[PDB]
Write an enzyme that holds these catalytic residues in place. Structure first.
Site, PDB file in Angstrom:
ATOM      1  N   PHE A 153       0.017   4.112   2.712  1.00 42.37           N
ATOM      2  CA  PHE A 153       1.236   4.596   3.338  1.00 42.37           C
ATOM      3  C   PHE A 153       2.037   5.545   2.455  1.00 42.37           C
ATOM      4  O   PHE A 153       3.256   5.639   2.584  1.00 42.37           O
ATOM      5  CB  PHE A 153       2.025   3.438   3.986  1.00 42.37           C
ATOM      6  CG  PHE A 153       1.138   2.392   4.645  1.00 42.37           C
ATOM      7  CD1 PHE A 153       0.408   2.690   5.786  1.00 42.37           C
ATOM      8  CD2 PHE A 153       0.995   1.127   4.090  1.00 42.37           C
ATOM      9  CE1 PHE A 153      -0.406   1.725   6.396  1.00 42.37           C
ATOM     10  CE2 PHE A 153       0.152   0.175   4.679  1.00 42.37           C
ATOM     11  CZ  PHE A 153      -0.547   0.483   5.827  1.00 42.37           C
ATOM     12  N   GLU A 202       0.789  -1.252   0.000  1.00 42.17           N
ATOM     13  CA  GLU A 202       0.000   0.000   0.000  1.00 42.17           C
ATOM     14  C   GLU A 202       0.814   1.291   0.000  1.00 42.17           C
ATOM     15  O   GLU A 202       0.690   2.122   0.900  1.00 42.17           O
ATOM     16  CB  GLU A 202      -1.146   0.012   1.047  1.00 42.17           C
ATOM     17  CG  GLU A 202      -2.050  -1.211   0.990  1.00 42.17           C
ATOM     18  CD  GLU A 202      -3.525  -1.054   0.677  1.00 42.17           C
ATOM     19  OE1 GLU A 202      -3.896  -0.137  -0.094  1.00 42.17           O
ATOM     20  OE2 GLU A 202      -4.300  -1.931   1.124  1.00 42.17           O
ATOM     21  N   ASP A 203       1.624   1.456  -1.048  1.00 42.56           N
ATOM     22  CA  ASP A 203       2.477   2.617  -1.263  1.00 42.56           C
ATOM     23  C   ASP A 203       3.628   2.789  -0.256  1.00 42.56           C
ATOM     24  O   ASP A 203       4.169   3.895  -0.150  1.00 42.56           O
ATOM     25  CB  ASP A 203       1.675   3.925  -1.485  1.00 42.56           C
ATOM     26  CG  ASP A 203       0.828   4.007  -2.754  1.00 42.56           C
ATOM     27  OD1 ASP A 203       0.785   3.004  -3.513  1.00 42.56           O
ATOM     28  OD2 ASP A 203       0.204   5.083  -2.990  1.00 42.56           O
ATOM     29  N   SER A 204       4.047   1.708   0.448  1.00 43.16           N
ATOM     30  CA  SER A 204       5.246   1.819   1.276  1.00 43.16           C
ATOM     31  C   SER A 204       6.418   1.184   0.510  1.00 43.16           C
ATOM     32  O   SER A 204       6.189   0.559  -0.528  1.00 43.16           O
ATOM     33  CB  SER A 204       5.049   1.265   2.690  1.00 43.16           C
ATOM     34  OG  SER A 204       4.585  -0.072   2.772  1.00 43.16           O
TER      35      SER A 204
END
Ligand SMILES: [Mg+2]
Ligand SMILES: [Zn+2]
Ligand SMILES: [Zn+2]
Ligand SMILES: [Zn+2]
Lengths: 33, 84, 46, 134, 263, 56, 65, 56
Positions: H35, D3-5
RNA sequence: CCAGGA
């Protein structure tokens, strides 16, 4: 003749000192080329 | 006005909110050094003590269930079914 | 020894105190710096 | 890295990958009040006012300025200043509470009015950590 | 000879190409890990700055000084300051380096890892010498100064491992491959038309027999034979990256046996 | 609306969120610094007395 | 600004190789790809270190104090 | 925003290092978090009663 | 207000 206030100059304009300055001049003036 | 025990018509089962509030209240009281109505089988957390008291229905509290008109039915924690 | 303040352009040391005149000796320029502490600073090389 | 990390090579980070310098210039001046009632750039003590910052004044020199090199760390007073009343009120400038670093450049100059003017630059290195955006 | 066997392919000051046969992949890897992370080295760890007139920050420079490789041959006879008995550092646990540089020249004055000088007593042990692999013999370029640009500082180099900081990493990249023909079926080759045409053949293919299509899948088959290349940074010689790696892992296992013993 | 229906509040904390495959569904990773600031007022009782004295 | 000592990805010292690279280009006229390879920079992680460096220090030196 | 009762949920503390609030990935959806630089709020109950409310 | 972040 008579003083009619002070006008803020734009950097690198005809009236600015930097307009006619060489790379080497600017480095002396602490200004980034 | 207070509805007689023989005329009570609310659920014979304890609501999620009731149970959460009884557990909250007992745990609070237990934590304020109130007398505990059960054998703490080594227990130290007042909520886990509260859970234990409610598990054995040794909690001396009553739920005053208000009706929209203002009247109410009082129900003992001992008498409320805990299907939650 | 001791250089309280340094000059911005000509880089000549000044060492002046309170109410001495905020200016450099030779050049005009009121700029002036501070010169590093003599209390040597240590850094971890990470 | 869900999730976009993202995952960073901690080995690379040590070698200098994505390290950055950070500077911040705190500023102050000595305010003059009509009848020559000026402010003062000094290291103050108790001396009647007692209304002074709770951070280490001890890092300051006689001119109320930290020397460039000193490690500032919390609320350590970066600039010492005072103003009297008809006496040392405290007009001191501490390091931004959250921050820490090393005094970089201290500039002692004159205002257009001919007043005491100060700019304190504080430097730190910011090494890539966890919530750091890229 | 005995258990797992080595067959060196190429050697230099900087590289070891070899074949490790009769070994568990787990073992080959655990050794690979140790070489990267757990072998001790000497590297600058504290930098006291007396003067810096440079265009670079005190800590910017400081950081670089840690990444400068230092002679860690006799690293084993130096103590970790943590384990040492002094107050901060000493000779038994550190190497003190000094660096004084100044722009005398009108031209740009360079600061090299060669410009570092040892000030501590070495106890006559091969340690703390800035590693110079440089043809012109300068080593690492630390800084550039102009005229009145002075750099005066002091370095304390300490024994450490790559787990604490990657500066104590004695090894550069470690090459590691096995089964150049995918005989083990350990990868499912992504392709568009033909996986054989699309994917480049390994160097090591020459050191193994091609599978020959007219044969069933060897499930019984297991992973032994590992084609590796160990690259050194300087601190320790290539061979000793392998040896000390083998030894560290051995010591690491011994600690467990000993722990059980005390229990 | 701004001081009564909503209020600025104590025992609040805020930071950047990041995911974790090793946390249990119902838990929340709390940074040490945040834990060291936020506080719970616990009543001294025979049950906790010793523990509490230790944290003190 | 100022050549990185050690490649970020593998940590092969790259600090010594700078002037030598810049020399293999002016003095030897050689193309970037051969000079890098001459200098033994084989892995692209190491190649990118020198190939994509911007030595800003040299401009920084142009200012007097 | 908090356009849901699920936008505010009760979690178990887990004190951890590093400056971020860590959450289980499957709990992402109710909050509507990712995130990419999202921050989240934490409120601490002060009473045995309040705690029960959260947990129960 | 101004500039920005999800
Ligand atoms: Mg987002
Ligand atoms: Zn001057
Ligand atoms: Zn010692
Ligand atoms: Zn590399």
């Amino acid at each position: 003749k008579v003083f009619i206030g002070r006008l803020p100059i734009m950097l690198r304009s005809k009236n600015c000192y930097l307009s006619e300055a060489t790379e080497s001049d600017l480095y002396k003036l602490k200004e980034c080329p | 006005k207070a509805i007689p025990k023989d005329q009570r018509a609310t659920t014979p089962y304890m609501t999620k909110y009731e149970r959460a509030r009884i557990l909250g209240t007992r745990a609070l009281q237990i934590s304020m050094n109130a007398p505990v109505f059960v054998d703490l089988e080594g227990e130290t957390d007042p909520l886990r003590i509260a859970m234990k008291e409610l598990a054995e229905k040794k909690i001396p509290l009553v739920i005053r269930r208000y009706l929209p008109d203002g009247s109410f039915e009082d129900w003992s924690v001992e008498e409320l079914i805990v299907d939650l | 020894a001791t250089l309280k303040y340094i000059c911005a352009e000509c880089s000549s040391k000044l060492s002046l105190s309170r109410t001495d005149a905020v200016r450099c000796k030779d050049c005009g320029h009121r700029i002036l710096l501070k010169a590093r502490t003599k209390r040597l600073v240590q850094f971890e090389a990470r | 890295n869900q999730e976009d990390s993202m995952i960073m090579n901690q080995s690379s980070i040590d070698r200098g990958l994505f390290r950055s310098l950070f500077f911040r210039s705190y500023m102050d001046q000595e305010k003059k009040y009509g009848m020559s009632i000026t402010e003062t750039f000094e290291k103050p003590q108790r001396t009647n006012t007692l209304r002074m910052k709770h951070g280490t004044y001890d890092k300051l020199d006689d001119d109320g300025l930290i020397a460039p090199g000193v490690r500032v760390s919390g609320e350590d007073v970066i600039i010492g200043k005072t103003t009297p009343i008809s006496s040392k009120r405290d007009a001191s400038t501490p390091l931004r509470s959250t921050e820490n670093g090393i005094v970089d450049q201290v500039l002692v100059t004159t205002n257009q009015d001919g007043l005491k003017f100060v700019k304190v630059r504080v430097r730190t290195t910011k090494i890539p950590q966890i919530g750091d955006k890229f | 000879e005995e258990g797992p066997q080595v067959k060196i392919r190429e050697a230099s000051k900087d590289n070891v190409d070899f074949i490790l046969s009769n070994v568990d992949l787990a073992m080959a890897n655990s050794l690979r890990r140790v070489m990267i992370a757990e072998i001790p080295t000497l590297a600058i760890d504290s930098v006291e700055v007396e003067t810096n007139t440079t265009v670079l920050a005190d800590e910017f420079i400081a950081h670089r000084l840690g990444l400068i490789p230092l002679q860690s041959m006799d690293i084993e006879q130096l103590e970790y300051s943590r384990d040492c008995f002094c107050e901060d550092h000493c000779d038994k646990c550190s190497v003190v380096l000094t660096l004084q540089a100044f722009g005398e020249s009108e031209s740009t004055t360079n600061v090299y890892s060669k410009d570092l000088v040892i000030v501590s007593n070495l106890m006559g042990r091969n340690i703390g010498h800035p590693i110079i692999q440089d043809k012109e013999g300068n080593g690492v370029l630390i800084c550039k100064l102009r005229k009145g640009q002075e750099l005066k500082l002091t370095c304390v180099a300490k024994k450490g491992i790559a787990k604490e900081h990657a500066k104590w990493g004695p090894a550069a990249a470690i090459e590691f491959e096995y089964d150049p023909w995918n005989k083990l079926k350990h990868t499912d080759y992504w392709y568009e038309q033909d996986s054989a045409k699309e994917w480049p053949q390994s160097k090591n293919c020459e050191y193994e027999d091609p599978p020959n299509e007219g044969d069933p899948f060897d499930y019984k088959a297991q992973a032994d034979t590992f084609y590796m290349n160990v690259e050194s940074v300087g601190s320790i010689p290539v061979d000793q990256v392998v040896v000390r790696g083998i030894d560290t892992l051995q010591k690491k296992v011994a600690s467990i046996l000993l722990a059980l013993t005390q229990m | 609306r701004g001081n009564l229906m909503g209020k600025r509040v104590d025992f609040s904390a805020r930071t950047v969120i990041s995911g974790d495959p090793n946390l249990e569904l119902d838990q929340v990773g709390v940074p040490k610094s945040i834990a060291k600031t936020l506080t719970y007022p616990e009543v001294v009782t025979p049950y906790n007395i010793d523990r509490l004295t230790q944290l003190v | 600004m100022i050549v990185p000592v050690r490649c970020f990805s593998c940590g092969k010292v790259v600090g010594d190789k700078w002037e030598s690279y810049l020399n293999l280009l002016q003095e030897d006229e050689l193309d970037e790809g051969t000079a890098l390879s001459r200098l033994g920079l084989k892995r692209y992680c190491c190649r990118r270190m020198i190939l994509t460096h911007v030595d800003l220090i040299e401009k920084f030196l142009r200012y007097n104090p | 925003p908090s356009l849901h009762k699920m936008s505010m949920m009760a979690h178990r503390v887990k004190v951890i290092p590093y400056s971020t609030f860590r959450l289980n990935l499957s709990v992402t959806s109710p909050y509507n978090a990712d995130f990419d630089g999202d921050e989240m709020n934490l409120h601490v109950p002060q009473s045995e009663e309040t705690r029960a409310e959260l947990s129960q």
